[PDB]
DNA sequence: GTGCCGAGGCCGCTCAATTGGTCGTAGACAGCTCTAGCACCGCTTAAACGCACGTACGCGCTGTCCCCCGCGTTTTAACCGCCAAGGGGATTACTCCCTAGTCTCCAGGCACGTGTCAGATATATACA
DNA sequence: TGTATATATCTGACACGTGCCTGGAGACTAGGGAGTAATCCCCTTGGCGGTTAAAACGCGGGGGACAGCGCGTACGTGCGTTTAAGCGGTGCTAGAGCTGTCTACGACCAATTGAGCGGCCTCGGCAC
């Protein structure tokens, strides 16, 4: 499912940061960097869910997992 | 007579004192003196964010506080950016354009 | 019969997406990617409705913040267009690698 | 059941900007900021009693964690605003 | 008076490399590494019970905090080594 | 009579770890007996992992005692041991990169 | 104890650059390295004063430097005991 | 005479300072710098014998790690000599203000 | 190979590990109530893939200043060891008065239902 | 041709005010944290004047930085039109959450006897 992010989807993300010209090989590199960062948050949410003997990832499992990495996100109960 | 009106603060004193005794530690004791100073720090930090966010709302002719104004007030200030190092959901970043891209 | 200069159309999108607060990445392709990665750790996993919006807000904020430091490396090297090698340079200083 | 600060944030806004309001999305942003600060104040003050061989946490441990978590500037104004309610609550 | 791990670090080294030794400058590095890990294990396991409405820290909380702190690989080997001493201590 | 560390086959003290846990976290909580045995195996496995890589590199520099310099190369040289130990060893230097 | 910013000489910064992998060093590096180190030193020294005044002491002990460096993110070993 | 080329002498210092774990910054000039900063926070302050060495080990480790990320910006910009403008670029990614 | 001060192994002292016994109240797991997760029906129209052709960033080559390396006389002030006087850290004994813990009294706080205006749609004109 | 400004509209959702139940507040007594003085003697700061590492000023000339002419291929802008995002919803039943009962297994308390801290001494690792 690595083909979820299309080409114009990555271009829209670079316009917010301040990137004018985007190379053609950026779409091939952005998918690899995002997959590495996503592997640390998804795996951390599985361990937090199995500790409570639950099979459904709740909304609080993502907040408690992102606090240890440093990217604290608000607006989701904490 | 509640302990919040006697000290001149809006934060609950009994709630902060009850929460502090349920964290750390077992041998540690949290008296009534620590609850008064703890409610003053949370109230001053709350009014400081609402003051900078409420000033920018008067430019767009709006009434309710939007999450977009909360990001421009926290990230735009050089004193509240190092303290609040989180991420506001639904606010974006500060619109900045470099001089080498024009 | 009427074509703009290569640079005026790209500069108009900077002042538009920076003011909006909606999500840039869609919800359907992003939901299928989370279920695939989580399937390797625990099979037959489920996600709540609010759990999808929490992961999308952190993924978009991380990609936007990373592009800010990545574009600074191109201007510092007397260039304008970003390069794939500039991502690994900023990730090494931050501590990701 | 749900112990939050949804009734205390709107009271402070009415004292400074009475001609303003709040939304459902903006309520969770201000509520998460207060909970994150309280977790850092109680966490920093807990290590002060253990490192100094103490136990009773009074008003001296709360003021110590203010100047440590804040890089000055705003930390000076919190000292005058914190001690104003301590003397008023005792001498009453 | 001085509760440290100066007698337990040298005992593990004798079981692997008996033809080696230790110094005073190297003992402070190994003693500070165990103290820093123990402060992170107890700190991570404390939030596992409060967020799930619990009040007892058993063997399930220590194993849960291992995979959360270790970036895999070495976290898998600690499960087989941790559970080996738990069953041996109970079934004895 | 019989120590708790000898029955479980570990070198770390079990009574010292269980005693220090009750004074930290938490207030109105209790520390289980099974948590002290599992915590002693984590500190023992991490200690032997650093001493294993440091003892092999120290045998090549015709030295017997473990120097603080070899302890830095055994941690910073390993990729898995670099992200876990994010501190700074006093008197060890860095990896000779050129 | 006045104008002690001239303690870091020119060859003192050259020894620190060779450990990382810096070949040639410019002339304006000495004017910038002294300002960067002064900013970083102002966060650890100030944090040690607050930790010392809490114990009603006047001398900065060795334990106050380790507790102040752990909060900033630069944990230093060896000086723990 | 026996004048070496400008380049073969600077490379020898990289393989020498990276092998020894000695202190690069002196102790006497660095002691007066710490007392000047701590003079505005609290007057009549003292420092122990071990407190001075702890601050010196952290200052050398911070300057070494800062020069590693700064030297990488020169190779990306097709340069060799470091510049003061390259130091502010690496400090912005880590989050160091001012 | 030649010299000096830290590491390994002993004896002795006394903090706190380990046993047995009694009983509070955490949490294992029995069944029941009903939120909101997963899969699939199809119309409307945003946005993704494919690809035409100039436009203007990245590329490499090579001047010519004026960057700061490399080597050596003279110089400022660091490291070395040892002297004497007194700041303010250490653990050591006593009682004031902080704040943990038990019932009873009665209001702050917070779930659900209720009006009507904040600010989101997308039609207008007038400009940047 | 491209973003703001303007009056109009639409119905989701913020603010208001009760119904009722925890969990804030107050008087009281029990007992241990740490008030703030009273002690000995750790190891900070300041003093002098030797030796000899390494800091500072100045020399000549290699090879670094980065101005600017111009080859040639990657990617900006936009017409045409592939195929899957998102909207209106309806049915089935996983497994989150709240409330029961009564056994599994830590805390507290109080006499034993061995783990391990502090101070000694003899090499025998590794510094010049």
Numbering used by the authors:
A (entry chain B): 25 to 102
B (entry chain G): 17 to 118
C (entry chain A): 38 to 134
D (entry chain H), E (entry chain D): 33 to 124
F (entry chain C): 16 to 113
G (entry chain F): 22 to 102
H (entry chain E): 38 to 135
Copied sentences from the primary study:
Nucleosomes containing both H2A.Z and H3.3 variants also exist in vivo, being primarily located downstream of the nucleosome-free regions of active promoters. Recent studies, including ours, have revealed that the incorporation of H2A.Z increases the accessibility of entry/exit DNAs on nucleosomes.
Mono-nucleosomes were reconstituted following an standard protocol using recombinant proteins containing either canonical Xenopus histones, mouse histone variant H2A.Z.1, or human histone variant H3.3. We next performed single-particle cryo-EM on the H2A.Z-H3.3 double-variant nucleosome. The final density map at a 3 Å resolution was calculated from the best class without imposing any symmetry. The model closely resembles our previous H2A.Z nucleosome structure, featuring DNA asymmetrically wrapped around the histone core. Notably, our MNase digestion assay reveals a small but significant difference between H2A.Z and double-variant nucleosomes, where DNA located at the internal sites shows greater protection in double-variant nucleosomes compared to in H2A.Z nucleosomes.
